[PDB]
């Protein structure tokens, strides 16, 4: 499948929308530090078995 740029990134908290918009890209003028997200992106991969 294709990889989409979204804000629905799994296993995230309020730090997500804190810097990122409704889309998944941080606002122009936002202050970031080591670890934060700049572009929300997810890649498809099922299986895994667990």
């Amino acid at each position: 499948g294709p990889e989409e740029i979204t804000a629905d990134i799994p296993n995230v908290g309020e730090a997500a929308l804190s810097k990122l918009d409704e889309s998944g890209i941080v606002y122009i003028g936002a202050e970031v530090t080591g670890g934060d997200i700049l572009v929300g992106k997810v890649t498809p991969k099922g299986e895994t078995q667990l």
């Binding site: 294709p2 740029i5 572009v39």
Partner: protein
Amino acid sequence: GVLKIVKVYLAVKRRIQPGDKMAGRHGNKGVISKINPIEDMPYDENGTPV
């Protein structure tokens, strides 16, 4: 490759951290050690330190 991409230009401002390679104009190489308060550097008859 495939699909859309996002570039994020973020600008940072670095101060003279202890270890930066700084030199003169006559092959005067040098690397800064410590930082040192103004309170304990060589001064003269006036308040002017170095």
